[PDB]
Structure formats: structure tokens, C-alpha cells
Write a protein that binds this DNA or RNA. Structure first.
Ligand code: MG
Ligand code: MG
Ligand code: MG
Ligand code: MG
Ligand code: MG
Ligand code: MG
Ligand code: MG
Ligand code: MG
Ligand code: MG
Lengths: 55, 142, 211
RNA sequence: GGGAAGCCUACCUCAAGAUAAGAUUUCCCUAGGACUUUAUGUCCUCUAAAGAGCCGUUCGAGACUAGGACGUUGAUAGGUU
RNA sequence: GUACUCUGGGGAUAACAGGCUGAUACCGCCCAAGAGUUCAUAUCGACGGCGGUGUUUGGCACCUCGAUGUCGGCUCAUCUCAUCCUGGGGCUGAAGCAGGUCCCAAGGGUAUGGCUGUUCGCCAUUUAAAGAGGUACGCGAGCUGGGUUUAGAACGUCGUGA
RNA sequence: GUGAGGGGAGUGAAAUAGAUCCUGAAACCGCAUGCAUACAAGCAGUGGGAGCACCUUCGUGGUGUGACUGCGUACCUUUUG
């Protein structure tokens, strides 16, 4: 099956009106003072007062 | 250019009360629709609503002539395959006179947004008393 | 009709003196606490609103806290109403308790609950359709719906056509169940038959309406 | 007046987007300026209430959604007994 | 001669379906000799006449040949009453149990197999019953391809031959 | 990223003449401003028409949008149509 007429740009945009993105949950860490994803380990290896990959 | 139209902001609507006991449905409905659309005012315009508010009292006391008390049938249809409901005038005016008057007046009014706005200016009550006492309505003959 | 709000605990059997095994269902009932009484002059109808369960203070909002404090009862896990008459309203004041002693052994009742959800289901399981042949050159169409209607008259699909969709998870009332017995020290009602819902769901038991 | 598996109620479910948008109980928000076009007027300063959402552990809920319970004042999930 | 076929064109012109018409078919009504029996307009009813719907066979060529692509079977349904059962009545050669005719009533229900591609029809055994029809003679961008109507081969008939 | 690409400086009469290099249109695709739009049915226009927003040779004026309303079933071929 295929369309019988063109779809105007208005209907196309009305259909695309549900394609908006959303932001993530970012919080400031209490220990390192850096922005990080909530409930996630910081990129340096720190999470909840603990430090992985001791250097 | 000299022919002017009514400004919708400058139109004023006044309240009236009509008693519907022992009156024929058709003539009363025509008069109500005429006074509701605004044909009685000299500033009448077809695209502006200049009517008045009409309150009907004693809605169940309306009467019809001949044998239309049992032969007048009202039909409605739900788009289901077998949903054709049919009712009589007697039972309908017994338990819902407002539907009777609303049908009678909507049948004689234009079909569109202006008609939908005009039909809201009519109030129908079965009892002999109406809550719109603050607007100070004036009694109308018929 | 004054009823009770209980929780389904599971199914069991009970052997009589003659040896007949009766399949029963257990409903545990915490003593309901009357929260509000609705009369005709203020609301237009007469009813009794009760609550049951237990909820922590962190999950109860300020509005519900004020409502329960006005009622003078502890906060429950749910609240339900019962449409009653003035004859059944004798000795029913706010803050009271509707115990399990409302029913008697041998009474016919109705049980209302929430059925289990099966998810998006097809026609065969939902409307008891018939499956086509699996052999004799049959194509990919095995459990399909089949035809839908006529071609040009009316030329559309009628409203109410049976098709695939969500199944279950809906309010269901089963009438005609006999309370096989009631135990007040454990506050339970064992009733003959099966009731809708899974274990741990809320059910409503009311007196029968057909008698 | 009597009068049928016929109609309206009666039984079960849905239902106020019924734009005619209904009702009940409870809860929350009571500061200091400037200017103009003196108006539920526009810019500043000071607080963000009751609640909802984001996130996480999850389900007898579930295509994605939505819905139910819980988040150290904890038995929501895993482990152990 | 082409069923091995091909090109340019047509609904100007056929086969299927729709439309107009209702000769034909179905149903109803009027008069009525006669008949079962010696009589009951209880029940049929000759010779004649008047209408209704559009379910059969037909007539006409208005749409479609720069395509409306199907005989039957399967799954899935919806509507009409000219009612098969269940429901309510009048009359009767209605003693009762039963039967026959007519009126009202569409809520629900309204078989399995053998033989054939079968629709249909015949047969065996059940049920309260196994109703008549419309919907592109419902439904093939939902399934099947057994029949018809491509290309191979043979028999019977016709042709000197294709 | 010792990449592509871009912003400065500089050359040039001219750099939206920068090597995808004279001028550089339409279909098509973004951003900003102004008005309208989430209870009302169809060739999307036309004749009226209130309001709103910027202009002023401050008007029985201009530029945009335009709720509400009467009427209104595209173009070409071939045909009795
Ligand atoms: Mg089968
Ligand atoms: Mg149509
Ligand atoms: Mg001709
Ligand atoms: Mg009949
Ligand atoms: Mg019968
Ligand atoms: Mg098709
Ligand atoms: Mg409306
Ligand atoms: Mg609006
Ligand atoms: Mg115009």
C-alpha cells in the first residue's frame, strides 16, 4: 500500500511534534564538587565518599 | 460605507421571562427563536449576535394540538450497528422537557458557531421558579 | 449496602463431615474505620466512606492528614465508599469500626475485584475465535482475524468490531458466593468459590443484590 | 381496565472534553520599590508554599507508555539463615 | 486456421458486477361454479380481474477495456420479516392429548457425517429447530485454487489439411 | 585531534571576489518578529466585517493578521453528456 496524495508539511510537522528530546538528571557531587549523572560514578572514579582506581 | 454594522462590544442583552403553560409549541418556539436571534432590533446584523436572554417557566405544561401527544416521535442514533433509539413526546416531556424545547428552538436557528452561541442564551426550567433572580428579568407576554 | 474491604490471601479446601471437599478462598479483613457519613441534604445521596490499611506518615499528604484528623481515625492504605440507605445507617457514626461480624455463616454475597492482566492479546484468546488449517497449502495466515466486513456497502468497519487489544485488569463482580465460615479471632472470611484477582489484591464483599 | 421472550427500568461494566466541563472533605500561598498607557498595567528587589516531575530499587502491571509499592524516619530488589 | 501469437485503438461494442424497465418469476387482494361429505365462505378452489417488492430467467447498452481481476470452500460478521423453535391470541370435523387456517411478535437460538469441484440435491443418525432473503449472487491488498478459461499428450465426433 | 572547519590580523577597488572562488533566480529546508488558532466539519476562495501590532502627508489613512458571516463540488482532453 502507498499514499494517494502528498502529505503537506503541516501534517509532517504535526506528526514530528512528539520528537522532542529531554535532559538528564545532573547533580553536583558533595565530595568532588563536580557535575555528574545522578546515581552514577564520576568519570574520575569517585562515588559516595569512595574512590575507585586508587592513584 | 455609510451602512454600519453593530459593534459586538457595544451590544447589550436584556433578560426576559416567558411562561409556557397552555401554549402551542410551534408558535412559542418561533417567537423565542425570533427574539433570540435579534430580528426585533434596528441594529440587527447577520454576523453579530444581538439577541436577548429568554427564560422559559413551566416547561412541562406546553401543549400540542391534534393527536401529536402520542404520534410525535423523536429519534436518535448511536453509530453502533443497531443503536436506533425512538421515544414518544409524552414520556419525553414527562421526564425531560428541556430536550423538547432545545430541539424545537435549535431546529429554527442557524447551523454554525453563531447558532451555537445563540442557543446558549436560552434557559429552560420545569419548575415555576428560576435561579436567575439577580439579573432582574422582565415578564414577557409571549 | 454495607460491605467490607478485604485482601485475598489464597485458595484452600475444606472437608465436611460427609467427606465432600469444598474449594474455598480466604479474605483477611482488617477492621474498617468509618471516615465519613454522607447525607441527603449536603451531598444529594446517603453513603458511608470508610478506610483500611496502614500507611507511613511520609506517604500521606497534608490534605489526607487533615481529613483523617477531622475523622479522628488512623490513616489507611485505601478509602472506599458504600451506598447505603437510612435503615442501614443506624449506629453508624464517624470514627466507628465495621468488624467482620457483619456477615453470617451461610449467607450469599457478591465479591468485586480486579482481574489479572494478560497484556495485548489476540483474537483467539480474547474473543474465542477459531484457528484456520495449519496444512493443505495454508499461507502465513494461521491465527489472523480473517475478514472484516462487506466491500462497498457500507464500505467501512462497524463500531464494536471484535479485534485484538488489551485483556484483563478490569473491575469484575462475581455474585452468588456462599460464605462457608467467618473467624473473628483471626478476622478472616473463608467463602466457597473463586474470586477475581491475584493474591494480595483488594476485594470488596457485599450482600447479594438478587435476594 | 386486563394483556407477550417485543419497548423503558431492573443486572454487570464504562462514563463530567456532559465546553451544560457537576458535588463533597481537607490542605497551601497575606513583601518592599520605580515608571507609564491608571490597567487582573510594565520593569526591579526578596521568597518558591501545599504538590507534581526528573532519578534509583521493583511488580501477580506492562510493546513504549500508563498504573501500584518503596527510597536509610527502609523489608522495595539481590544475597544469608 | 492461430489456445504460439503481435501492434494501433473502443466502454462508439460484447462476457461478471451496478443502473433503468418488470415481459417472466415470487407474494397479496376481488368475484366465484365445484369439492371432499348430505351441509358448514372449517379447508382448497376452476373460468376471469387488480396490485406490491426487486430475490429467478429476460429486454435495453448509461459507467468501467492508458484493467471494477474469481465458481465453490475457510475465518468473520451485519440487516429485513414474507417466523423454523421458544412467546401471546381468534376460528375450527376444538371431548382431552393433539392437528389445520389467520393475527401480533426479530430478545435469543437456529447439527454432525457418507457420495460429488460442487451451489443444489440424495442418504444415515440427532435436536426445540436444523427458516427465507439483502449486503459487487457480503467477505481472495484476510487464507485456499478443487472447477472454469494459457502453453504438453490421448480418446469419441467433424474437417483432405492446418 | 599538529585533522576538517571557523574567528581575528593582513593583501586586495571589492574576501556573502578564499580557490566547492563573476552576477547569482525557483522548487526545497532553518531562525526571529507581528497577528490568528486546541466545541467545531468539505476544491481552502470571494463580498462584507469587530479586534490587535507598527507607521505616519494624524485619517469618513497605510502596512500585516484577521475571529463571525452569505455564496461556492480544481485544470486539460474526449464526448449527447
Ligand atoms: Mg477449526
Ligand atoms: Mg458514506
Ligand atoms: Mg442509443
Ligand atoms: Mg409478521
Ligand atoms: Mg409460535
Ligand atoms: Mg480491494
Ligand atoms: Mg457543544
Ligand atoms: Mg475556541
Ligand atoms: Mg476577503
Amino acid at each position: 500500500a502507498v499514499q494517494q496524495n502528498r502529505k503537506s508539511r503541516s501534517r509532517r510537522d504535526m506528526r514530528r511534534s512528539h520528537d522532542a528530546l529531554t535532559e538528564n538528571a545532573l547533580t553536583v557531587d558533595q565530595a568532588t564538587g563536580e557535575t555528574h549523572r545522578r546515581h552514577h560514578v564520576t568519570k574520575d572514579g569517585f562515588y559516595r565518599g569512595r574512590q575507585l582506581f586508587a592513584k | 460605507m455609510k451602512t454600519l454594522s453593530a459593534k459586538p462590544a457595544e451590544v447589550q442583552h436584556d433578560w426576559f421571562v416567558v411562561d409556557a403553560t397552555g401554549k402551542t409549541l410551534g408558535r412559542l418556539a418561533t417567537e423565542i427563536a425570533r427574539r433570540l436571534r435579534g430580528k426585533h432590533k434596528t441594529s440587527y446584523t447577520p454576523h453579530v449576535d444581538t439577541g436577548d436572554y429568554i427564560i422559559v417557566i413551566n416547561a412541562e405544561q406546553v401543549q400540542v394540538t391534534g393527536n401529536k401527544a402520542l404520534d410525535k416521535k423523536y429519534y436518535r442514533h448511536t453509530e453502533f450497528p443497531g443503536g436506533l433509539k425512538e421515544t414518544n413526546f409524552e414520556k419525553l416531556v414527562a421526564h425531560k422537557p428541556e430536550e423538547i424545547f432545545e430541539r424545537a428552538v435549535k431546529g429554527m436557528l442557524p447551523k454554525g458557531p453563531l447558532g451555537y452561541a445563540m442557543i446558549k442564551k436560552m434557559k429552560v426550567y420545569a419548575g415555576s421558579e428560576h435561579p436567575h433572580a439577580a439579573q432582574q428579568p422582565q415578564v414577557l407576554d409571549i | 449496602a454495607i460491605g467490607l474491604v478485604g485482601r485475598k490471601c489464597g485458595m484452600t479446601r475444606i472437608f465436611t463431615d460427609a467427606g465432600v471437599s469444598v474449594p474455598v478462598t480466604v479474605i483477611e479483613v482488617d477492621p474498617n474505620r468509618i471516615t465519613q457519613i454522607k447525607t441527603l441534604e449536603t451531598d444529594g445521596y446517603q453513603a458511608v466512606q470508610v478506610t483500611t490499611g496502614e500507611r507511613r506518615e511520609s506517604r500521606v499528604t497534608n490534605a489526607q492528614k487533615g481529613h483523617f484528623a477531622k475523622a479522628g481515625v488512623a490513616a489507611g492504605r485505601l478509602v472506599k465508599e458504600f451506598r447505603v440507605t437510612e435503615a442501614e445507617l443506624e449506629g453508624r457514626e464517624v470514627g466507628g469500626t465495621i468488624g467482620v461480624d457483619l456477615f453470617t455463616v451461610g449467607q450469599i454475597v457478591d465479591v468485586t475485584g480486579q482481574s489479572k492482566g494478560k497484556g495485548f492479546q489476540g483474537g483467539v484468546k480474547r474473543w474465542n475465535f477459531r484457528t484456520q488449517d495449519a496444512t493443505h497449502g495454508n499461507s502465513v495466515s494461521h491465527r489472523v482475524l480473517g475478514s472484516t466486513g462487506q466491500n462497498q456497502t457500507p464500505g467501512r468497519v462497524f463500531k464494536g468490531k471484535k479485534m485484538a487489544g488489551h485483556l484483563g485488569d478490569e473491575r469484575v463482580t462475581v455474585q452468588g458466593l456462599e460464605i462457608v465460615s467467618v473467624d473473628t479471632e483471626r478476622s478472616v472470611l473463608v467463602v466457597k468459590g473463586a474470586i477475581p484477582g491475584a493474591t494480595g489484591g483488594d476485594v470488596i464483599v457485599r450482600p447479594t443484590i438478587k435476594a
